[PDB]
Amino acid sequence: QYSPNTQQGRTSIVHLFEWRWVDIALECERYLAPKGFGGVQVSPPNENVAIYNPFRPWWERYQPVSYKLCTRSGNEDEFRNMVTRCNNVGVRIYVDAVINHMCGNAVSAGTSSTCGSYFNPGSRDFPAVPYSGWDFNDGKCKTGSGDIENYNDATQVRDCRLTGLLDLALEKDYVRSKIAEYMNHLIDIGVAGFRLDASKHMWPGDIKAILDKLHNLNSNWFPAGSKPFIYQEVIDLGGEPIKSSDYFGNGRVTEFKYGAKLGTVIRKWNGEKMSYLKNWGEGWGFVPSDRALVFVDNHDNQRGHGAGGASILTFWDARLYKMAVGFMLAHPYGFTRVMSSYRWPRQFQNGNDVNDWVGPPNNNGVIKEVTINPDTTCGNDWVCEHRWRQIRNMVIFRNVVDGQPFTNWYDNGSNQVAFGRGNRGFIVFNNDDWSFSLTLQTGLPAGTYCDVISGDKINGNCTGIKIYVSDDGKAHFSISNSAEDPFIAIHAESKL
């Protein structure tokens, strides 16, 4: 469960949040494959509640109605088309699996659902599965409200309703089997693995029992006996009784400390400085590298109400965000996920964004296509961070340096730092309030290298900065503190 099952040489996934299946399929072919992306995390592909107050929020997709592959992203045909087309160009699909719960207990009964299936939350009736009252934790939960009240009680966190979401009885073989049926449908279509949503709210042993029922990956694309990559969403910032290590038997875990701390560091908040990043990884109290799924922001915390609070960096903070993503992609710790977002009309009132519910760009609820602009950016309010040169080129950097050791660290005791990855790549940051101008040991072979942050190698030309590495491995770097992108990265495949 620990291996991503990406094609050899591909080392990241991108969350194409709320994208339509047809747009992901095209994106695999026209961009993700040639630019070396390992795979895509898709939004939940199973039928959910169509919530109209507020108007089609992103979070409706976290309230299942059935396991039909029928959503605002597309239908089953379109989902299958996408997985096939992506696998056929060596780009994998990872499904966001919403398996802790069905929908909110107070949602009105009817057919307000993305495939029109009937459901009745009040009577616990989801006939498109089918589930009934016997399949939920009403009896097992011990709180007065039936909802989770106290995260200091690890039992109620698992057995009671997360903000009123009907909590599936995951100890039951019937329920485990219906979930496995859904997941095996997806595996056989060709998915490479799963994000397990709300894993903190499930017992590690119930997750185990579900995973036990799963097929090996599709043998047209994956070697025999391949197992789905599993990354469990466990939000563990320390201090709580539930620890993400309790989930290591089942797969990797999301390391939410990663972006919270990195954001604080890059913002230079709480006395933090980039020079402290020398021992980044387990030294900062994180999970072992081989069990981490890391990221700067995710779809929830980029809205500010999330794990990491105000320190989280997002596309709204573009300049610092690129630096944080670049550091993450250069550093060997963890398996990296890049976010790809849409814009929405933020409106703050006492620090809270009252529009943080807004769903993807849409025409009266129909999701808008991702358009590609002549400069390779996206239109229709899709942010397409994964297309920003500085991020896409660092996804490639990570591929190029795969397996190479963290080495040749430099710091100035403040916020000017640099490091290499064996003899294959080197990166330099200036986050201080004065310029960086210094000759550093890069560990790289002599030559002229294109800086892949400011530009690209095209044939035998660079379109941005050139760095000149001498016979002894040393090169000069100049970075103004006022620089648009105050970091430089070079690697074996950017050498002229």
Ligand X SMILES: C[C@@H]1O[C@@H](Oc2c(-c3cc(O)c(O)c(O)c3)oc3cc(O)cc(O)c3c2=O)[C@H](O[C@@H]2O[C@H](COC(=O)/C=C/c3ccc(O)c(O)c3)[C@@H](O)[C@H](O)[C@H]2O)[C@H](O)[C@H]1O
- N- to C-terminal Cα separation, the chain: 39
Size of the site for ligand X (CB under 6 A): 15
Q: Counting contacts by CB under 5 A, is residue 298 touching Cl ion?
A: yes
465 contact choice in ligand X, Ca ion, Cl ion, none (CB below 5 to 8 Å, kind-dependent): none
407 touches 420 (CB < 8 A)? yes
Decide whether 33 or 107 has the Cβ nearer to ligand X. 107
Q: Report the largest interatomic distance among the alpha carbons of the chain, rounded to a whole angstrom.
A: 75
Report if residue 264 touches Cl ion, rule: CB under 5 A: no
Tell me the DSSP string of 191-242. --EEEETTGGGS-HHHHHHHHTTPPPPPTTTS-TT---EEEE-----SSSS-
| Closest to 418 in 3D by CA, of 437, 435, 440 | 440
Is 267 annotated to bind a ligand? Reply is no
- CA distances (Å), origin 75, targets 45, 107, 115, 346: 9, 24, 9, 30
Question: Can you give the three-state secondary structure of 35-67, one letter per residue?
Answer: CCCCEEEECCCCCEECCCCCCCCHHHHHCECCC
Show contacts with ligand X in window 213-252 (CB under 6 A). Answer: 233, 235
- The answer to the question of residue 197 lying near Ca ion (CB under 5 A) is no
Q: Which residues contact 130 (CB under 8 A, 6 or more apart)?
A: none
Q: How many CB atoms lie within 10 A of CB 77?
A: 11
Q: Give yes or no for a contact between 450 and 490, defined as CB atoms under 8 angstroms apart.
A: yes
For residues 105 and 161, the answer to whether their CB atoms sit within 8 Å is yes
Residue 124, marked binder: no
Catalytic-role residue among 18, 233, 272, 356: 233
Is residue 201 annotated as involved in ligand binding? yes
* Binding-site member from 19, 31, 62, 321 for ligand X (CB under 6 A): 62
Of 61, 150, 43, 159, which Cα lies nearest the Cα of 103? 61
Binding to Ca ion by residue 201, rule CB under 5 A? yes
* Residues of this chain, 327-366, that bind ligand X according to CB under 6 A: none
Q: Please report, for residues 27, 163, 208, 231, the alpha-carbon distance to residue 196 in angstroms, rounded to integers and kept in the order given.
A: 24, 18, 12, 6
Between residue 92 and residue 111, which ones bind Ca ion under the rule CB under 5 A?
100
- Cα separation, 118 vs 228, in Å, equals 31
Residue 206 binding target from Ca ion, Cl ion, ligand X, none, CB below 5 to 8 Å by type? none
String of contacts with ligand X for each residue 65-104, x by CB under 6 A = ---------------------------------x------
* 119-127, 140-148, 194-202, 227-235 -> range binding Ca ion (CB under 5 A): 194-202
Residue 305 has what DSSP assignment?
Answer: S
- Name the residue number minimizing CB distance to ligand X: 62
Residue 66 phi, psi dihedral angles, 5° rounding: -160, -175
**Which partner in ligand X, Cl ion, Ca ion, none is near 276 (CB below 5 to 8 A by kind)?**
none
Q: Binding residue per annotation — 158?
A: yes
> Interface with Cl ion by CB under 5 A: which range of 180-188, 268-276, 292-300, 463-471?
292-300
Is 197 known to be catalytic? yes
Per residue, the 3-state secondary structure of 434-468, as one string, reads CCEEEEEECCCCCEEEECCCCCCEECCEECCCEEE
Binding residue for ligand X, selected from 8, 53, 163, 270, defined by CB under 6 A? 163
Residues 197, 246, 272, 432: which is the catalytic one?
197
Task: Find how far residue 441's CA is from the centre of its chain.
Answer: 33
Q: Which stretch binds ligand X (CB under 6 A): 138-146, 202-210, 278-286, 298-306?
A: 298-306
Q: Is 233 in the site for Cl ion (CB under 5 A)?
A: yes
Residues of span 180-209 touching ligand X by CB under 6 A: 197-198, 200
Q: Which residues are catalytic?
A: 197, 233
Contacts with ligand X by CB under 6 A lie at 59, 62, 98, 162-163, 165, 197-198, 200, 233, 235, 300, 305-307
Which residues fall in the annotated binding site for Ca(2+)?
100, 158, 167, 201
Binding site feature residues: 100, 158, 167, 195, 201, 298, 337
Judged by the rule CB under 5 A, the positions of this chain that interact with Cl ion are 233, 254, 298
Give contact residues for Ca ion (rule: CB under 5 A).
Answer: 100, 158, 167, 201
